[PDB]
From a paper:
Subsequently, the three resolved SeMet-TSP4-N335 domains were used as search models for molecular replacement with diffraction data from the wild-type protein crystals grown in KNa-tartrate. The resulting electron density map enabled tracing of the XD3 domains. A monomeric subunit comprises four domains; AD, XD1, XD2 and XD3. The XD2 and XD3 domains share the same threefold symmetry axis as the AD and XD1 domains such that three XD2 domains splay apart and do not interact with one another whereas the three XD3 domains pack together around the threefold symmetry axis. Consequently, the opposing face provides an uninterrupted trimeric surface where a partner TSP trimer can bind. The third linker connects the TSP4 XD2 and XD3 domains by a glycine-rich flexible long polypeptide (Thr250-Pro-Ile-Gln-Leu-Gly-Asn-Gly-Gly-Gly-Ser-Gly-Ser-Ser-Thr264) that is structurally disordered as manifested by the lack of associated interpretable electron density maps for both the wild-type and SeMet TSP4-N335 crystal structures.
Bacteriophage (phage) vB_EcoM_CBA120, discovered by Kutter and colleagues, is a member of the recently defined Kuttervirus genus of contractile tailed phages belonging to the Ackermannviridae family. Each TSP recognizes a different lipopolysaccharide on the membrane of a different bacterial host.
Residue numbers in the entry:
A (entry chain A), B (entry chain A), C (entry chain A): 4 to 256, 265 to 335
The structure:
């Protein structure tokens, strides 16, 4: 019956043994000095409770019933400073303190390998309003599209999480998040030759960011009306000016000028080029008129049905879905 | 004196031994192939540094001095896709990518067992504005109440954390969070028989969500004035219409019409049904009047003290605590 | 050649052995009852895959290639209730459910030791609007300054993360975050002797919080115009009143009165004491005028260039960069 030697009081050992494994039935304790290790291993095969150190990935993984290998007790963020570079590849599980004090920069998300793959960035210096961070999903999509995205709010922090290839990276956690920007086209470029109050574009744009010598200008500092950008204050000669059309991406949770403030007169219909959500009120020559009293507005048609005929040389201003 | 056999150069072993434990005083190393395991165990008793694999819970726990058993190096999020179901039980420590593309859905929070028990959800498809997610604390309260809560902002992500039974689940982490809704009553139900510009309610409601064929309508598309909801645009015949009273729950960080725009005349007192926070201004027939100049308003009394007598057939509009 | 005793079928042991380590080449398994331990150790020296229990820190650390010792599978949050105290030291890696139901309180961030050191707080009771939480970076700076910060939004949750000493603690994760306050000066103190509609300050302040018997008053309840605070409603005699100047700190993502509503007449220039971002419109005696039609405004100069001479006894109100 007995398969192997039996040591009823156990055994002491005074140098390192070389043991091909054991089923243990008692307490594994340690003494001062006792160092202890996990085996190196990069393989998919495993059994629940098996634990390892991954030398490739530098992560202590255990092998969980459903989903095999994974980091021990879920995961957590590995913070590091990021040298300001024009471009930087990030790794799953890290967090990057970004310093855009010097200018804009780009980070490139890693190839996703698992649902829940995560990368955290942070405007540690509060500089993204003026020097946006561009985030690149490489060829995989971000919010259902492969378009790069820029974060133009300073002090914003954000965890990107892989939802799978259909919607791709989505932000699961963050602070400070306003409108993401998806820049479509650099629709104006110019080394300004004189002091510049305004510039005219080749096309009326939807909505634009403006960049002076690679520094994003705040929306308070310029105004886009039709196809002219006006600059308050002006910009000096020699300035590297860029205008960039973009599509907003909403994370967190409007005035119309008719005929340059000139009233055609005896008209009941105003048509707004943009289909508008709502028109609560219209200011006429410093007098406010309210919807379903002074006027009727049809949303699909974008047509304001005026109650009475206009006079000649009146000033008309429209409020569009404002602080409802 | 010697208690057991001594092996001064250690021992080699060529098959698995069967060892009832040992105090180890040297380096436990491994060779290629070396697999290593933690013991299975679901018990409360433990000693600091004891480590285990929990087979019930599928989590690698260590036993920490204060609070015994816990996940190794705190925790972290276990992401998984969630099949769109009308209802779904979630587990502590998981995160759920939700797909509400097809319609609304409900998730039910687990029984809490420990302070800091956490569950993460995510509108991965940006669909909660139109197909809200309802979150259920089962019988335990959420923000101090056992009422279910709905998230109607798309692209929102949110970690719910157990604070104990008094306040219950609270969101500790998230992105996109606007107003939670706590639906009190389905105050109107109807299969519409004609095209519908408006509907009258059995009661004037405080604030309402509207649902057409189980899809939540945006606040831009309808207006609730007194006890009539008006619809811009209209809704087709056959539509499954629902109106739902709810109480907001504020996470992140207003016009009054008097006598249907008809002035009674020679009056100095306007009373606002809702007690109002503040009344900066009143528009009278397209002329704005400012508080503590044109008028005096008392907040508890909700009474606007007009400086001069009203004329007959004037239009009066009040601004209530607007963009201060 | 043979260095030590060879046991070709392994060995059984019936009591605890005392082994000075081994290179293991096979499966370490366990039986029911098998308890297993990591060695205690608080030292910087280590080799990749070495694992330990830290008795000082109560954390199960592994030794990662780059950065040696660290919590196993990154980290995660250790939630605990916080006894309401006037002041409380927090520990790295914990999260604190705060109860400010009873009144304001202060938490003090720990000495940072590693980039990514993190502490989470949470207004579990939704009480910070009325009883702000003050956060102290001790002598280290927070957002580049050593000034304490107060959170006055209820239901806010927030993780503070060490970015290194230059910018110091930054919030990397959170919910509900509005304007941080950095209180500079208690610029008014008084036990009120009568019912109080208003109080006059020794200095015109920029922006102020107000506290009645240690409870922060909501901005709806009082108004600061020039150097007079007006109170709507009033405050009872015996009230412990405090006014506090502060500088906002923006995380998430305006009316000017000229000569007390009295028009000097025949003037084209209005100068605004604060340099203003933008002035879209000016209300004159209940008539709105729009920028670049009715008027021209220069931002650096803060000068409104009126088109026509003022009349005597007119009312002028200015809109400053409002809901653009």
């Amino acid at each position: 019956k007995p398969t192997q030697p039996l040591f009823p009081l156990g055994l002491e050992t005074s140098e390192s043994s070389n043991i091909k494994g054991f089923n243990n039935s008692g307490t594994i304790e340690h003494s001062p000095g006792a160092v202890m290790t996990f085996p190196e291993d990069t393989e998919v095969t495993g059994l629940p409770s098996s634990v390892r150190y991954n030398p490739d990935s530098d992560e202590f993984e255990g092998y969980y019933e459903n989903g095999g290998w994974l980091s021990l007790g879920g995961g957590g963020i590995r913070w590091e400073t990021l040298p300001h570079a024009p471009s930087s590849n990030l790794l799953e599980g890290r967090g990057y303190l970004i310093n855009n004090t010097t200018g804009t920069s780009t980070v490139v998300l890693p190839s996703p390998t698992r649902i829940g793959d995560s990368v955290t960035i942070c405007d540690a210096y509060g500089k993204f309003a003026t020097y946006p961070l561009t985030v690149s999903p490489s060829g995989n999509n971000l919010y259902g599209s492969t378009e790069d995205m820029a974060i133009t709010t300073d002090n914003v922090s954000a965890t990107f999480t892989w939802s799978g290839p259909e919607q791709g990276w989505v932000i699961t956690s963050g602070v400070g998040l306003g409108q993401g920007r998806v820049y479509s086209r650099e629709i104006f470029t110019q080394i300004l030759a004189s002091e510049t109050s305004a510039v005219t574009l080749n096309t009326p744009p939807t909505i634009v960011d403006v960049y002076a010598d690679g520094k994003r200008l705040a929306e308070s500092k310029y105004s886009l009306d039709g196809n002219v950008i006006t600059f308050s204050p002006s910009l000096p000669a020699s300035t590297e000016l860029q205008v960039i059309e973009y599509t907003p991406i909403q994370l967190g949770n409007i005035t119309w000028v008719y005929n340059g403030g000139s009233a055609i007169g005896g008209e009941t219909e105003i048509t707004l080029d943009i289909v508008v959500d709502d028109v609560p009120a219209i200011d006429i020559n410093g007098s406010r008129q309210y919807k379903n009293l002074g006027f009727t507005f049809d949303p699909l048609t974008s047509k304001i049905t005026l109650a009475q005929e206009l006079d000649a040389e009146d000033e008309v201003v429209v409020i569009i879905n404002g602080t409802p």
